Amino acid sequence: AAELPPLVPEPGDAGQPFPLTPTQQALWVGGCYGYFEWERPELDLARYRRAWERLVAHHPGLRTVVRPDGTQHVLERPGPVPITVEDLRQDPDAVRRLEESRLDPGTWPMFDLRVVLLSGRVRVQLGIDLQLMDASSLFLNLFSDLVTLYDDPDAALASQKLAFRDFARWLEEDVRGGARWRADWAYWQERLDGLPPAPDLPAARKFERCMVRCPAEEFALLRERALAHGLTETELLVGAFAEVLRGWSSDPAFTLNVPVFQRFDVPGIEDVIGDYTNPILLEARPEGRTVAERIVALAARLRADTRHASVNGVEVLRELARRRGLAAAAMPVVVTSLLGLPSAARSITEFGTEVHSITQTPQVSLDFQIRPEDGELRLVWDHRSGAFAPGVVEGAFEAFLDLVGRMLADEPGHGVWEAPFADMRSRRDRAVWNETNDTAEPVPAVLLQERFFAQARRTPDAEAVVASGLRLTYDELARHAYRIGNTLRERGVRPGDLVGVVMEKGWEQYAAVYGILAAGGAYLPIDAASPRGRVARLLESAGAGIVLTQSRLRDELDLPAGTTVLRADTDFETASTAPLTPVQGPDDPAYVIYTSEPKGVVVAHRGVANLVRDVRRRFAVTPADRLLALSGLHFDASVYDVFGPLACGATVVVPPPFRRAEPDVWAELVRDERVTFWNSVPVLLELLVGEAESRDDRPLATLRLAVVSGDWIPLDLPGRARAQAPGLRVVGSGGPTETICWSLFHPIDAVDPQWTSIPYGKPIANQRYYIVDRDLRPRPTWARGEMAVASPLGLALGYLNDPERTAAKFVTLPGTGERAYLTGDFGRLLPDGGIEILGRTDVGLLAELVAACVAELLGLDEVPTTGNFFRLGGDALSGTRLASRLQDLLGAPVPIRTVFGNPVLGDLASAIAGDPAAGPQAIRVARL
Amino acid sequence: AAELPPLVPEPGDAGQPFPLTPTQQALWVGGCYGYFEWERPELDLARYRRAWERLVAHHPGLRTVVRPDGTQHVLERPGPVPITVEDLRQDPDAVRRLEESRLDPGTWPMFDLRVVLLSGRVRVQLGIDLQLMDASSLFLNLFSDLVTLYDDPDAALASQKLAFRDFARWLEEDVRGGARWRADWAYWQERLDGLPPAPDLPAARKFERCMVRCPAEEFALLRERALAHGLTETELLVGAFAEVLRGWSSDPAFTLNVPVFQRFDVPGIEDVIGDYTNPILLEARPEGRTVAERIVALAARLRADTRHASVNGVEVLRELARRRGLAAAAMPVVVTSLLGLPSAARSITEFGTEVHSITQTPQVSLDFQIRPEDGELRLVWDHRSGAFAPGVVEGAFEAFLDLVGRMLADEPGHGVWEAPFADMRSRRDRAVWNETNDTAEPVPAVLLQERFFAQARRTPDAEAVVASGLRLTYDELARHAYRIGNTLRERGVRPGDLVGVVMEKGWEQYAAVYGILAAGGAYLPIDAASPRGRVARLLESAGAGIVLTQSRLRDELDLPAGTTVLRADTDFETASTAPLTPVQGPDDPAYVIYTSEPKGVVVAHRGVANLVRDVRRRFAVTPADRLLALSGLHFDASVYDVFGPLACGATVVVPPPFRRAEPDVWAELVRDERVTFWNSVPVLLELLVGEAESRDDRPLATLRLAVVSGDWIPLDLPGRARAQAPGLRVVGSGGPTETICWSLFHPIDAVDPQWTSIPYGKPIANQRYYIVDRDLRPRPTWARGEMAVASPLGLALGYLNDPERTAAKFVTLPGTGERAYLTGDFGRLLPDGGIEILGRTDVGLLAELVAACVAELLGLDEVPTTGNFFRLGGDALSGTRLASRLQDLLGAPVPIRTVFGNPVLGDLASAIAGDPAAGPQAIRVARL
Numbered sequence A, B: 001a002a003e004l005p006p007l008v009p010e011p012g013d014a015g016q017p018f019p020l021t022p023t024q025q026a027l028w029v030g031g032c033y034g035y036f037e038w039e040r041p042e043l044d045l046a047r048y049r050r051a052w053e054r055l056v057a058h059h060p061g062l063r064t065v066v067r068p069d070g071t072q073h074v075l076e077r078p079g080p081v082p083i084t085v086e087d088l089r090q091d092p093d094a095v096r097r098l099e100e101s102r103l104d105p106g107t108w109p110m111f112d113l114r115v116v117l118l119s120g121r122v123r124v125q126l127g128i129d130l131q132l133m134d135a136s137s138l139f140l141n142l143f144s145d146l147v148t149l150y151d152d153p154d155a156a157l158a159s160q161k162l163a164f165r166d167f168a169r170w171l172e173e174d175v176r177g178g179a180r181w182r183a184d185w186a187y188w189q190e191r192l193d194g195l196p197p198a199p200d201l202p203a204a205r206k207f208e209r210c211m212v213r214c215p216a217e218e219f220a221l222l223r224e225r226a227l228a229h230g231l232t233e234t235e236l237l238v239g240a241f242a243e244v245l246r247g248w249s250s251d252p253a254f255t256l257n258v259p260v261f262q263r264f265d266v267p268g269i270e271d272v273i274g275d276y277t278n279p280i281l282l283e284a285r286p287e288g289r290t291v292a293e294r295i296v297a298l299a300a301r302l303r304a305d306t307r308h309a310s311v312n313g314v315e316v317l318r319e320l321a322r323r324r325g326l327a328a329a330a331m332p333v334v335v336t337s338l339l340g341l342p343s344a345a346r347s348i349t350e351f352g353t354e355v356h357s358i359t360q361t362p363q364v365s366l367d368f369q370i371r372p373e374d375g376e377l378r379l380v381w382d383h384r385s386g387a388f389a390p391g392v393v394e395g396a397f398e399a400f401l402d403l404v405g406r407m408l409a410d411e412p413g414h415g416v417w418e419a420p421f422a423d424m425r426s427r428r429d430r431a432v433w434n435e436t437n438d439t440a441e442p443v444p445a446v447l448l449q450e451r452f453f454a455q456a457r458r459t460p461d462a463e464a465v466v467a468s469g470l471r472l473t474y475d476e477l478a479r480h481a482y483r484i485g486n487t488l489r490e491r492g493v494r495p496g497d498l499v500g501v502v503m504e505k506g507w508e509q510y511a512a513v514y515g516i517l518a519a520g521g522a523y524l525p526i527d528a529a530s531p532r533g534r535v536a537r538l539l540e541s542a543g544a545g546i547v548l549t550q551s552r553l554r555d556e557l558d559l560p561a562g563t564t565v566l567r568a569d570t571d572f573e574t575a576s577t578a579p580l581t582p583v584q585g586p587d588d589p590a591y592v593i594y595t596s597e598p599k600g601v602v603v604a605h606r607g608v609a610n611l612v613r614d615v616r617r618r619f620a621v622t623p624a625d626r627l628l629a630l631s632g633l634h635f636d637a638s639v640y641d642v643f644g645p646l647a648c649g650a651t652v653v654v655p656p657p658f659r660r661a662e663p664d665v666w667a668e669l670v671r672d673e674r675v676t677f678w679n680s681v682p683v684l685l686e687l688l689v690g691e692a693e694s695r696d697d698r699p700l701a702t703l704r705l706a707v708v709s710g711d712w713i714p715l716d717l718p719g720r721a722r723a724q725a726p727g728l729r730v731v732g733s734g735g736p737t738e739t740i741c742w743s744l745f746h747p748i749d750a751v752d753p754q755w756t757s758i759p760y761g762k763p764i765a766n767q768r769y770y771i772v773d774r775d776l777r778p779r780p781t782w783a784r785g786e787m788a789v790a791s792p793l794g795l796a797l798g799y800l801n802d803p804e805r806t807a808a809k810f811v812t813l814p815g816t817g818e819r820a821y822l823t824g825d826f827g828r829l830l831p832d833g834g835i836e837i838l839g840r841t842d843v844g845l846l847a848e849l850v851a852a853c854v855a856e857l858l859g860l861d862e863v864p865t866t867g868n869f870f871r872l873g874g875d876a877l878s879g880t881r882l883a884s885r886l887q888d889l890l891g892a893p894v895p896i897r898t899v900f901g902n903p904v905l906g907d908l909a910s911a912i913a914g915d916p917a918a919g920p921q922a923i924r925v926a927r928l
C-alpha cells in the first residue's frame, strides 16, 4: 500500500472543463438510458418541483453536461427543471395508453422527468443517462435526497465539501501514473495474457429481467452462510454465479466484470454525485474439489484483484484489446453489487412503490445485479434478449436459485457445500432427454447368419444379390455360403477366429461374409486397393491366417505366403451344401473393421441385430425393397448393406467395382434395377442427384428411402433429391464405427433456413446420446460438449488387441455407471430432444532493440518482441529503469509513461518509433 | 510565367545547416560512386596537391558533408585534402595489379583522390559520391577548375557571389509552394494519372557501357538534321531513343526520365558547385504516321513539360508512387543530356586522356548520356548488367546507331524521316529467324483417304484399329470405309458436303471418317455427350443433313427429324465393298472442327497431309508403332490420331469411352497393347505417369514417343515420364485448331532450371512462327508480342460460313504479304530460334465530405473520393478556394499546403483527419 497524494479542491475553476472518467468515456462512444417508474396515490406537484429545483442546485453533477469536444463542465445556472405532466384521468384503458409511451449527454438535462396523472393514483417516471452518475450515486445520493426533499424541500443537506470535478482531476493527474498505480499496473500486466475470455454461452441465429427478492430472514441466513466460509455476501454470490455459468459455458474458465464503486475515503466524497465505477476483471478458473472450496478460492482472487484497484479496469480492457481483438476483449458478463456500501438516509421505496425499471446498458449481455432494498436483498439478472439461445438465461436462473436455495438449506460442511458439482440441467432438460433416450429394447439372440438362412428358407427363389449380369437367388447364395462355411469349418476356423475378405464389389463378398459366420468366425474386410503391403500389415496384425478373395484378383495382391488364400468362386465348388449348426454366441464378434496405428473395431452379432431390426421397423423395409450396396465392405457403412435387406427377403443390387465416383453408372443402375433404398455418404448422393438433374427421364424415381451420413449433409441436397425422386424420404444419420454403422437418425422432412447444419438426430433402439462436459457429466440444453454414446449392446466390444485404448474411449459414465463410447464429436442438445453436430520494419529493429535491453535488465537469455514486459518478469521498480536504459542507449527521451502505457515490447518500440519528441534518433540507433 | 521571388544571399549562416535537395534526398536512402581515371606521362604532384587545396577552399560544395540527422553544412576548415599515392613502378604486370584495386556522405571528403605511379606514365583516379554535385557541376565547375588550377594553382577564379546553401534554401522556401510552383503543380497533377509506366523491357532469370563518339563533322550534320525539324539535338536524340526503345518494350507507351539542370539564371550561380538536377517525366506516346512526325510531336511535349519545371520531378515521383506502387512509379530509363549548357573554360580532356569512367547510379537500369566533348558528341548508354535479357541492350544500341546513321544519310523529308517505322531486329535476329523458318516443302497432292487405301493394299492383313476386344485389320477397315463411302455417295454426298460423326470412342469413328472422305465429303465430329440439343445446334448450323452414329448410342441423341441418320455398324452391311474413285481435290475440306458463337475451323487435305508427313519423318513413325487414340474425334488433337498412323501401316489402339480420366485403364492398355506413341494434353500424361509410379511393374515401358500439348507442360513431367518409360522421347507441341493439330515442336531433352516454361518450340514443315507487335510487325529477340503462324497450306481454309471473322484472324502480314493466322497467343523469340509461350472509416466520411465540396466547387454532378483534384478539373486558383471552403465547412484550418501536397481526395481527407492542428473537429463535422 503505497500511500496516495491528497486532494486539493480547486473551487476557482468549479465550472472549467474536466475529462470524462474512463468508465464514462466508454459510454460516450457506444441507446443507454436507465429508467424508473414509481406509483403513488397523491403527488404534490408544486412540492415535487420545489424538490427537484433544490436538487439540481445542490448537486453539481445534476448540472453537468458533456461538450461536443468530448469533455464536460458544470453549468452555473441551467434553467428550471423540465417536468412534463401528462393528464390521463379522463381516458378509459389509460394504463394501455400509458405503456404505449416508449435523451443525450450533449443537452442538459441528462435526465427526463415526467408525471402521469391517472384515476386515483399517479406515476412518477425518471429517465437517466448511464453516464450521468454511477449506480451508487443514484441510490446513495440522488434517491436518498429526492426523498428527503419531497418531504421538506427546504430541509438541511450536508454541505458539499469538494467538487466531483476536483475528484476527477485528482484521479487522472495525481493518481493515474503515481507510485501506487504503477505497482498495481504491474499486477495486472503480469496477469493479463493469462486472463480467459468472457463466458462463452450459447447464442441464437432489448433487455429482459429475471428476479428474486430474499426476505430479511433469508438474507440474514445467507450472510451467516457466507461468513461461515469467511466470505462476504457478494463473494458468495459471485462464486455461486460462476458455478452456475459453467453449466452452459464452452470453457470452464471465463473472466467476469465485477465493478466496485470505491471513492477512496476522500473527506466529503460520500455526498458527491459522480461516477465511481471501476470494473475489475475477475479470472474465474475452477479451483477446488468441492463447491465450497472453489467459491472460497475465487473469493480470494477477487480480494487480491481488488487490493490493486487503483488501476481502473477500463485501462486493463484497453490493453487486453490491443493484444487480442476488440471482440476478444469484451467483458459483457457483469456482477454489479451495491452491497458493502454506506447505508443511506432514505430509500426510494419510501417515495413510491416501484412499477417499472430497466437499466439497459450497452455492450453488456448479462448483468447480475446484487442490491439491498428494505432489508431484503434483490437478485436481478438483466439480460439482452437475443444474446443467447432460447431459454439459456431462464434455465440458468433456475439453476442459480436452486444452488442458493441449497446453500440456505444445507449446513456449512455438508450437502451442497461439499458436492463435487451441482447438476445444472433444468426439469425440462432431464424430462426431454429421458423421453428421447428411453430406447431399451430386447434383441433376440438370433445370430446374424442364422437370420438370413431362415430368410433363405422362407423365400428361396427370390432375388438375393443382383450384381453385374448375375442374379444370385436366396437359395443360390445360401448354398454357396454353406460351401464356404463347411470348408472353412473343416480347415480350422473355431469361434472367435478372423478371416480376411480382400475383394472388390461383387456377390463373392456376401458369400464370404455369411460363410465365415456360418463357420463360426468373424470377417475382417480389407481394401482390395490398399497401397504397398498394408493388406499384409493388417492381416498380420489382426491375426487372420485365412483370406478369402476373388479368382480375378488373386495375383494382384501382396499376401504373405504362410497364410492360406482361397477364392470364393472356384476353390469351393466341390464342398458340401449341407447346413451348418451355429457354434458362436450372439455376443461373439461378427466382424472387425479397421479405422485410421490403425485400430480394429470389434463388433458382436447382437448390436448389429439391433440395427437391422431398428431400420426394418423404423423405415418399413419389406422384401419388395432393393438396396444399392455402394459403400465398401471395409467401411462401417456397408454393415447395414450386408445384414439388413438380406435378413428380411429384400434384394441387394451390387454396383460394378469403382475407383472413382461414377454417378452416370449409378443413376442408370438405380433406373434399371428399380432401386428403392440408397445408403452412401452425402457427397455421393449429391453426385447421383447431380447426374439425374442433367437427364430427361426421372432415373431416380424408384428411390423411396435415401439414408446419408458420414460427413456434412449440404442444406440443399434433401430438397434436390426429393425432386429427382418424388416421395423420397431423405434420412440423415451418423455415429462412428464403434457405435455400429448408424446409431441415430434425423428424418429430413423440411430444412429450416435458420439452421446451419441438419440436426444430427435422435438415438436408435438401445442407443443413448449424452452430451457431456470434460468430466463426463451431462450438460444442459444448448450447452456444447462431447457426444458420449451409451449402450450395453450397441457399442463395439472394444479395440482389437488393445485393452488400453479401449479403456480410454469406452468408459463408465460416472453419473450412471453406463458404459459409453466417447465419440470425440462435439455438439449440443436442442430443445426438442435432437442433437446439433458442431465439429471435431524500422519498428521491427527498435523492437529487437527494446527486447535486448529488456532481456539484459531482467536477467534472461532471450526475450521476444511480442512479450509483455511485466509478464516477462518486470515489476514497477524495474519498469522505471527500462525507461532509463532506453534513454541512454537511444539518445532519445523515453518517458516513464511511454514504458507503462506500452507493456508489450513491440508496442513500446512503435510508441518510441512514432514519438514526435525523438523517434528518428531512436530509429537510427536501432539499425545497429 | 508567374515571376519568381529573388534570392537573398544569407552569408551570416554560410555554415549553418540546410536541407538536401530532393534529388539528393533520394540518393541518401538508396553503392553510388561515379569514377574517373585519367592517364598522363608526368604529374607534378606538389602542383596537383596545391591545385586541390585551392579547389577545396574556393568551392563550398567541396567542403559540404551530410550530418547523421539527414541535413548538411559547409565545414569552414576541413583539413588537408587526402591524396593517396601508390608507387607501382618496380612491379612487372603493373596494369594487372592496378585494375585489381576494386566512401560515404557522412565523412568528409565526399571524394577519393589517388595517383598511381607506373613506368613512364601516371594514373589520376578521382572517385565522387553522386550526391556531392550533379553532372553539370562536375563538368562545368570542378573539371574546368581542376584544369585551370593544375596549370596555375594561384590563377584567378571568378568570385563566389552566393552560397549553394543560399540557392538551396531559396528553392525550398521561396520557390516550392509559391505562385509559379502551384500553376506548374496543377500541370503535373492534371497529367499524372495518365502517365504510362517506365519502359517495359525484357528481363533475365554491375554497370556496362555502350558508346559511340560523333566526330565534329557528323555532330554538325546531326544538328542541321535536328534544326531542319525545329528540334534541338537533344530533342532529336530523345525522340530517336524512344523509337528504338519501342522495338523491345511491351507497350509502345512509356515514361522516360529526362533530367534538366536549370539554375534559374540566378546571378553568380554559373560558378557554384551544387546539385541542380530536376527529373522530368516525359510521356512518350507514339503520335504520328512517320518517324519524323513522331519525333517532332514528342519534342513538343518535352518542351511543354519543361515550361513547368519549377516543380521538381522528384515530387511528381512521390505523388505517382502514392497512387501506384513504389515499383509502379520507378522511372529507371533516363536520358541525361549535358547539351544546351554554357561552354566551360577548360575541358578535362586537356588534363589526361580518359582511361576509365563509370557513373553507376542506383535505381537506374539504363541511362542514355548525351554529352559534348572536344567538339565531338559522346553517346553513352550505361546499363545495369542483369537488368535485361542477354543481348537486349547490345541489340538496341545497334538499332539506335543504325537509326541515327540513317538520319545522317537521309535528307529531311525523305528516307528514314518519312518511314512508317524502322525494323529493329538485329542482323542476328533476322539470321536466326530465317534459319528457323525456312520450312517450305512440297506436299504431294494425294488425298487423305487415298493414302490409307494405298496402305491397306500394301499391308492388308495387318492390325489397323485395335479397340475393345475387336481388332480391325487394314483390309477389314478399308472394306467398311468403302461400304460407308459407296452408300453415302449414292445418297447424295457431293464434294464439299458435311457429314456429322456423333459417336463415342471406337472403330466406328475411323470407318465413318474414311468413308465420308471416300465419298467426297468432309467429316464434322460432334461430341456424343453434348448437353441439351447442342448436337442439333451445330448440325443445323454447319449444314450437315447426314449424321453417322453408333447402333448402341442412336436413341440417346436429340437429332432433328429431317436429317438422315445411319449407324456405321448395322445400316451398312449390304453395301458394296467396291473401291471409290476420289472426286474431291487436295485443297477441298477434309473436316470441320468446332471451337468455342462457336466457330467452325475448316481444314483441307493438303495441310493435314503436311502434318502427317512431317511427323512420320521427324519421329520415325514405322508400322511397328502403336498409337493410343485418347483425344476425342471432336478435338483438333485427334486429327493426327485419325490420319497419322493409318497412313504408314501403324496400329491405332482405341481406348474404351470415358467420361472422366481413368489412368488405371490407360496404363494397363499401354501395357497389354504394347503402345509406343502417346498423344494427349499434358495433365492426362501426368495422370498416366502418376498411375505407373504406384505400380510394381513398368506398365509404360513400351512408350517410345509421347507428344503432349494444349496446356502448360509441368516442369517435372518430362523427367517423371522418362523414368516410367526408359528411352521415351517427350515432345512438347502446340498450335491452335486453325494451324492443324500440331504446328511446332520442342523435343524436351533436358529441362533447364532457369526456365519458367518449356520452350514452345520451332515450326514444322510449311509453318512459320512470327512474333509481331500490335501492327503485325516482327519483333526482335526477347520482345513480347502476338504469335502469328504464317503458311499457304498449313492453316485452316477459314471459319465456316463467316468471311468476316476469317478476314480478321487470317490476315495478310504487311511486311511480306504472307497469309498468317493470329493465334491470340503471346510469347517471345528466344536467342536459339525457339519461342517461349507467355500467356493469353472516419476518414471515409471526411473523404465523402472533401469530394462533395470539390464537386460543388468545380461544377460537377458526382466526384469520386479516389479522384485526383487537379485531374477532376481543378487548377491552381481553384485549389486555393478548396482550402478556403473546407476551412469554413469543417471549422478547422486547412492550409493551402495541405490541399496541394494531397491532390488525391482520399489522401486530403486522411491529411485533414490526422492533422494534429484540427483533425478531431474535422472528423466530427464529417459524420453529418
Ligand SMILES: Nc1ncnc2c1ncn2[C@@H]1O[C@H](COP(=O)(O)OP(=O)(O)NP(=O)(O)O)[C@@H](O)[C@H]1O
Binding pocket: A594, A595, A596, A636, A637, A709, A710, A711, A712, A713, A732, A733, A734, A735, A736, A737, A738, A760, A823, A825, A837, A840
Ligand atoms: N451428419 C453428419 N454431419 C457431420 N459429421 C458427421 C455426420 N455423420 C457422421 N459424421 C462424422 O462421421 C464420423 C464417423 O466416421 P467413421 O464411420 O467412424 O469413419 P471416419 O472416422 O470418418 N474415418 P477414420 O476415423 O479416419 O478411420 C463421426 O465421428 C462424425 O464426425
Ligand SMILES: Nc1ncnc2c1ncn2[C@@H]1O[C@H](COP(=O)(O)OP(=O)(O)NP(=O)(O)O)[C@@H](O)[C@H]1O
Binding pocket: B594, B595, B596, B636, B637, B709, B710, B711, B712, B713, B732, B733, B734, B735, B736, B737, B738, B760, B823, B825, B837, B840
Ligand atoms: N505447351 C503449351 N503451353 C501453353 N499453352 C499451350 C501449349 N500448347 C498449346 N497451348 C495453348 O493451347 C491453345 C490451342 O487450343 P485449341 O486446340 O485451339 O483448343 P482451345 O482453344 O484451348 N479451346 P477453345 O478455343 O475454347 O475452343 C493455344 O492457343 C495455346 O494457348
